[PDB]
Amino acid sequence: LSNGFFRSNTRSESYQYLSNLFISNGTLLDRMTKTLLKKRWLFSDEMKIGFM
Amino acid sequence: RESTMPDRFRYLTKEAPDSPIIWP
């Protein structure tokens, strides 16, 4: 299995890009987690409202 | 009473009254 070290590094770069994108927009997920803890149920219209 | 129901839909589980007929 010479094809096991290739997928791992691809997922590593995917994780790095996801981390770099999530770090800058951390306030969005922070307020959104506060909202989810506040009101138990949650939809996509609330996504688009709370993207600010 | 604890329930797994969202807060937005709470008004949709009650039967609203209707205006009675008046033309007779």
Side-chain angles (χ1 to χ4, degrees):
Chain A
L1 195 95
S2 37
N3 200 60
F5 299 109
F6 187 84
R7 331 265 198 79
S8 272
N9 286 272
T10 296
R11 301 185 50 174
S12 158
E13 299 222 316
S14 316
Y15 270 47
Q16 293 298 318
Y17 175 68
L18 280 166
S19 290
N20 269 285
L21 170 136
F22 278 165
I23 276 160
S24 317
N25 303 338
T27 168
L28 208 152
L29 321 179
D30 208 313
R31 319 287 85 55
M32 153 41 48
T33 297
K34 294 314 178 52
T35 284
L36 182 65
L37 254 192
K38 182 166 53 69
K39 38 176 68 171
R40 316 150 298 125
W41 282 78
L42 180 96
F43 297 87
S44 190
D45 285 350
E46 303 154 276
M47 281 327 78
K48 311 207 161 308
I49 288 162
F51 254 86
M52 41 76 68
Chain B
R1 194 178 37 214
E2 41 207 59
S3 159
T4 79
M5 171 177 183
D7 309 2
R8 329 194 321 176
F9 304 148
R10 204 85 222 175
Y11 70 94
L12 290 165
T13 44
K14 336 160 167 171
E15 211 186 3
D18 41 358
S19 158
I21 201 56
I22 211 56
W23 65 261

PDB file of all heavy atoms in Angstrom, chain B residues 1-12:
ATOM      1  N   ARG B   1     -43.221  21.844  31.164  1.00  0.00           N
ATOM      2  CA  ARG B   1     -43.097  20.596  30.419  1.00  0.00           C
ATOM      3  C   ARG B   1     -41.997  20.697  29.369  1.00  0.00           C
ATOM      4  O   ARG B   1     -42.051  21.547  28.480  1.00  0.00           O
ATOM      5  CB  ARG B   1     -44.426  20.234  29.752  1.00  0.00           C
ATOM      6  CG  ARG B   1     -44.500  18.801  29.251  1.00  0.00           C
ATOM      7  CD  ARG B   1     -45.863  18.502  28.650  1.00  0.00           C
ATOM      8  NE  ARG B   1     -46.394  19.645  27.916  1.00  0.00           N
ATOM      9  CZ  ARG B   1     -47.679  19.958  27.841  1.00  0.00           C
ATOM     10  NH1 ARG B   1     -48.603  19.240  28.459  1.00  0.00           N
ATOM     11  NH2 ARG B   1     -48.049  21.018  27.129  1.00  0.00           N
ATOM     12  N   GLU B   2     -40.997  19.825  29.476  1.00  0.00           N
ATOM     13  CA  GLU B   2     -39.885  19.801  28.534  1.00  0.00           C
ATOM     14  C   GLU B   2     -40.323  19.101  27.253  1.00  0.00           C
ATOM     15  O   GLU B   2     -40.900  18.010  27.300  1.00  0.00           O
ATOM     16  CB  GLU B   2     -38.672  19.104  29.148  1.00  0.00           C
ATOM     17  CG  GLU B   2     -39.004  17.865  29.967  1.00  0.00           C
ATOM     18  CD  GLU B   2     -37.971  17.586  31.041  1.00  0.00           C
ATOM     19  OE1 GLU B   2     -37.760  18.461  31.906  1.00  0.00           O
ATOM     20  OE2 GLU B   2     -37.370  16.491  31.020  1.00  0.00           O
ATOM     21  N   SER B   3     -40.053  19.734  26.112  1.00  0.00           N
ATOM     22  CA  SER B   3     -40.416  19.186  24.815  1.00  0.00           C
ATOM     23  C   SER B   3     -39.311  19.493  23.815  1.00  0.00           C
ATOM     24  O   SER B   3     -38.513  20.415  24.002  1.00  0.00           O
ATOM     25  CB  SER B   3     -41.756  19.747  24.319  1.00  0.00           C
ATOM     26  OG  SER B   3     -41.874  19.621  22.912  1.00  0.00           O
ATOM     27  N   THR B   4     -39.275  18.704  22.743  1.00  0.00           N
ATOM     28  CA  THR B   4     -38.282  18.846  21.679  1.00  0.00           C
ATOM     29  C   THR B   4     -38.809  19.684  20.522  1.00  0.00           C
ATOM     30  O   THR B   4     -38.440  19.464  19.364  1.00  0.00           O
ATOM     31  CB  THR B   4     -37.836  17.473  21.181  1.00  0.00           C
ATOM     32  OG1 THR B   4     -38.822  16.942  20.288  1.00  0.00           O
ATOM     33  CG2 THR B   4     -37.649  16.518  22.348  1.00  0.00           C
ATOM     34  N   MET B   5     -39.681  20.655  20.809  1.00  0.00           N
ATOM     35  CA  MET B   5     -40.356  21.447  19.795  1.00  0.00           C
ATOM     36  C   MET B   5     -39.802  22.868  19.752  1.00  0.00           C
ATOM     37  O   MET B   5     -39.591  23.492  20.797  1.00  0.00           O
ATOM     38  CB  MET B   5     -41.861  21.489  20.070  1.00  0.00           C
ATOM     39  CG  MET B   5     -42.633  22.464  19.207  1.00  0.00           C
ATOM     40  SD  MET B   5     -44.403  22.411  19.513  1.00  0.00           S
ATOM     41  CE  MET B   5     -44.964  23.589  18.296  1.00  0.00           C
ATOM     42  N   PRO B   6     -39.547  23.397  18.544  1.00  0.00           N
ATOM     43  CA  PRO B   6     -39.013  24.763  18.422  1.00  0.00           C
ATOM     44  C   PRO B   6     -39.977  25.832  18.919  1.00  0.00           C
ATOM     45  O   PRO B   6     -41.190  25.611  18.974  1.00  0.00           O
ATOM     46  CB  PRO B   6     -38.762  24.907  16.915  1.00  0.00           C
ATOM     47  CG  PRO B   6     -38.616  23.510  16.414  1.00  0.00           C
ATOM     48  CD  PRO B   6     -39.535  22.679  17.257  1.00  0.00           C
ATOM     49  N   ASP B   7     -39.439  26.995  19.286  1.00  0.00           N
ATOM     50  CA  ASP B   7     -40.243  28.102  19.792  1.00  0.00           C
ATOM     51  C   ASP B   7     -41.016  28.835  18.707  1.00  0.00           C
ATOM     52  O   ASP B   7     -42.026  29.478  19.012  1.00  0.00           O
ATOM     53  CB  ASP B   7     -39.356  29.112  20.531  1.00  0.00           C
ATOM     54  CG  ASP B   7     -38.469  28.461  21.573  1.00  0.00           C
ATOM     55  OD1 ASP B   7     -38.515  27.221  21.708  1.00  0.00           O
ATOM     56  OD2 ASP B   7     -37.725  29.192  22.260  1.00  0.00           O
ATOM     57  N   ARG B   8     -40.566  28.765  17.451  1.00  0.00           N
ATOM     58  CA  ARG B   8     -41.224  29.520  16.389  1.00  0.00           C
ATOM     59  C   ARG B   8     -42.578  28.920  16.030  1.00  0.00           C
ATOM     60  O   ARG B   8     -43.504  29.645  15.649  1.00  0.00           O
ATOM     61  CB  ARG B   8     -40.328  29.586  15.152  1.00  0.00           C
ATOM     62  CG  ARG B   8     -38.837  29.588  15.446  1.00  0.00           C
ATOM     63  CD  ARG B   8     -38.048  29.993  14.212  1.00  0.00           C
ATOM     64  NE  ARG B   8     -38.607  29.418  12.995  1.00  0.00           N
ATOM     65  CZ  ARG B   8     -38.157  29.664  11.772  1.00  0.00           C
ATOM     66  NH1 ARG B   8     -37.133  30.476  11.563  1.00  0.00           N
ATOM     67  NH2 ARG B   8     -38.750  29.084  10.732  1.00  0.00           N
ATOM     68  N   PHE B   9     -42.714  27.597  16.145  1.00  0.00           N
ATOM     69  CA  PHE B   9     -43.905  26.888  15.690  1.00  0.00           C
ATOM     70  C   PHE B   9     -44.977  26.783  16.767  1.00  0.00           C
ATOM     71  O   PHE B   9     -46.004  26.125  16.547  1.00  0.00           O
ATOM     72  CB  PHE B   9     -43.527  25.490  15.194  1.00  0.00           C
ATOM     73  CG  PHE B   9     -42.478  25.484  14.116  1.00  0.00           C
ATOM     74  CD1 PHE B   9     -41.582  24.432  14.020  1.00  0.00           C
ATOM     75  CD2 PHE B   9     -42.380  26.527  13.206  1.00  0.00           C
ATOM     76  CE1 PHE B   9     -40.612  24.416  13.038  1.00  0.00           C
ATOM     77  CE2 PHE B   9     -41.410  26.516  12.223  1.00  0.00           C
ATOM     78  CZ  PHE B   9     -40.526  25.459  12.140  1.00  0.00           C
ATOM     79  N   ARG B  10     -44.765  27.419  17.924  1.00  0.00           N
ATOM     80  CA  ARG B  10     -45.626  27.194  19.082  1.00  0.00           C
ATOM     81  C   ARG B  10     -47.045  27.700  18.840  1.00  0.00           C
ATOM     82  O   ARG B  10     -48.005  27.179  19.420  1.00  0.00           O
ATOM     83  CB  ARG B  10     -45.018  27.860  20.317  1.00  0.00           C
ATOM     84  CG  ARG B  10     -45.461  27.248  21.636  1.00  0.00           C
ATOM     85  CD  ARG B  10     -44.599  26.050  22.003  1.00  0.00           C
ATOM     86  NE  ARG B  10     -45.391  24.941  22.521  1.00  0.00           N
ATOM     87  CZ  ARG B  10     -44.901  23.746  22.823  1.00  0.00           C
ATOM     88  NH1 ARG B  10     -43.617  23.467  22.666  1.00  0.00           N
ATOM     89  NH2 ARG B  10     -45.719  22.808  23.292  1.00  0.00           N
ATOM     90  N   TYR B  11     -47.202  28.714  17.986  1.00  0.00           N
ATOM     91  CA  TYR B  11     -48.537  29.247  17.730  1.00  0.00           C
ATOM     92  C   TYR B  11     -49.299  28.395  16.722  1.00  0.00           C
ATOM     93  O   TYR B  11     -50.517  28.551  16.576  1.00  0.00           O
ATOM     94  CB  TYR B  11     -48.447  30.701  17.255  1.00  0.00           C
ATOM     95  CG  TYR B  11     -47.871  30.893  15.865  1.00  0.00           C
ATOM     96  CD1 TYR B  11     -48.701  30.984  14.750  1.00  0.00           C
ATOM     97  CD2 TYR B  11     -46.500  30.994  15.668  1.00  0.00           C
ATOM     98  CE1 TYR B  11     -48.180  31.162  13.483  1.00  0.00           C
ATOM     99  CE2 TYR B  11     -45.970  31.173  14.402  1.00  0.00           C
ATOM    100  CZ  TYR B  11     -46.814  31.256  13.314  1.00  0.00           C
ATOM    101  OH  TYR B  11     -46.291  31.434  12.054  1.00  0.00           O
ATOM    102  N   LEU B  12     -48.610  27.496  16.021  1.00  0.00           N
ATOM    103  CA  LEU B  12     -49.239  26.665  14.993  1.00  0.00           C
ATOM    104  C   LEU B  12     -49.903  25.406  15.548  1.00  0.00           C
ATOM    105  O   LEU B  12     -50.550  24.696  14.765  1.00  0.00           O
ATOM    106  CB  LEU B  12     -48.204  26.284  13.933  1.00  0.00           C
ATOM    107  CG  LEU B  12     -47.727  27.422  13.029  1.00  0.00           C
ATOM    108  CD1 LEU B  12     -46.471  27.020  12.274  1.00  0.00           C
ATOM    109  CD2 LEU B  12     -48.828  27.836  12.063  1.00  0.00           C
TER     110      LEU B  12
END
